[PDB]
Design a binder for this molecule. Structure first.
Ligand SMILES: CCn1cc(-c2cc(Cn3ccnc3C)cc3c2CCc2c-3nnn2Cc2ccc(F)c(C)c2)c(C(F)(F)F)n1
Length: 296
């Protein structure tokens, strides 16, 4: 690939914590320690709106499948569901007893999953805003939560060193160095897992075996989002503590590009759902989001 900087998105006044493309490809949402959500054009980075209401900083945000709703996870111990068009907070999800770190809708988008410093994973009904289940998932803060492609499975990770797979319907555990990030692959068959020893691993979840290992980046301190890029060449994409975006060939594990431009830890990356476009965001020395485009 030949990802090249096209736009730099400024506006947040503290570290940016997460960026996510809307499933319809129109928008990029960002969250920040500055308690704000910002929406930007996905293709030209054009600032669209600020969404406000959380009383403390935000760690994560995620889109509904129809791109109409956002959910945000905050240090104020709540999640908020937002109508993106109006910017209004529709529901406040109350129940966690510590910071909410990570969140995601299921594909049907009737449910939200959340992970917290209170070591629990919670499952929420989008329409009532009520907590359906509280999973005693981990013995340390939960670093990632993600649904598989039909919402039947939740994968979670934690600084307790574990990755667990949960049955959404029953909340019961199906299968079991800090694990700083996990997420299901685009075909459902794999889980990509980060550990705080500068290592990413591709796991066959059905077989329970590590298939590929990716190294070269720096990751000993922060939970950093990683991604599958599927619109062109099949890559793994991750931020890094040396301020670079790393892009590996999924099959060969070779680094194929390093994106230079940020001036702090690249805490979050995201891949556009249909075009060869990457968003990246960095910590407090930088506070900008960068949009990179590749011809392949
Ligand atoms: C509330 C405002 N806010 C949150 C963050 C933030 C964002 C992300 C990116 N992220 C978010 C969700 N999923 C991912 C990959 C990661 C971190 C942080 C700040 C805290 C943190 C992060 N990684 N490690 N720690 C210390 C730590 C120690 C023990 C633990 F068990 C755990 C779990 C963490 C930020 C900032 F962007 F500034 F970092 N601001």
């Amino acid at each position: 690939p030949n990802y090249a900087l096209k736009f730099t998105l400024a506006g947040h006044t503290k570290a940016v914590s997460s960026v996510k493309f809307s499933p319809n490809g129109e928008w990029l949402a960002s969250s920040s320690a500055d308690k704000l959500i910002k929406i930007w054009g996905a293709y030209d980075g054009k600032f669209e709106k600020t969404i406000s209401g959380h009383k403390l900083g935000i760690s994560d945000v995620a889109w509904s499948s129809d791109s109409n709703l956002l959910v945000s996870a905050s240090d104020d111990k709540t999640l908020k569901i937002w109508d993106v068009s109006s910017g209004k907070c529709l529901k406040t999800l109350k129940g966690h007893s510590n910071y909410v770190f990570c969140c995601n809708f299921n594909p049907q988008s009737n449910l939200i999953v959340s992970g917290s410093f209170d070591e629990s994973v919670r499952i929420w009904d989008v329409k009532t805003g009520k907590c359906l289940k509280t999973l005693p998932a981990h013995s340390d803060p939960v670093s990632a939560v993600h649904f598989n492609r039909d919402g039947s499975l939740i994968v979670s990770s934690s600084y307790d060193g574990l990755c667990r797979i949960w049955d959404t319907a029953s909340g019961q555990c199906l299968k079991t160095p800090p694990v700083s990030f996990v997420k299901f692959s685009p075909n459902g068959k794999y889980i990509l897992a980060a550990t705080l020893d500068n290592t990413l691993k591709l796991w066959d979840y059905s077989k329970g075996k590590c298939l590929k290992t990716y190294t070269g980046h720096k990751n000993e301190k922060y939970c950093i989002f990683a991604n599958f890029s599927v619109t062109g060449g099949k890559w793994i994409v991750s931020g890094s503590e040396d301020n670079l975006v790393y892009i590996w060939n999924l099959q060969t594990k070779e680094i194929v590009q390093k994106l230079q431009g940020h001036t702090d830890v690249v805490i979050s990356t995201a891949c556009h759902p249909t075009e060869n476009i990457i968003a990246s965001a960095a910590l407090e020395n930088d506070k900008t989001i960068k949009l990179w485009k590749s011809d392949c």
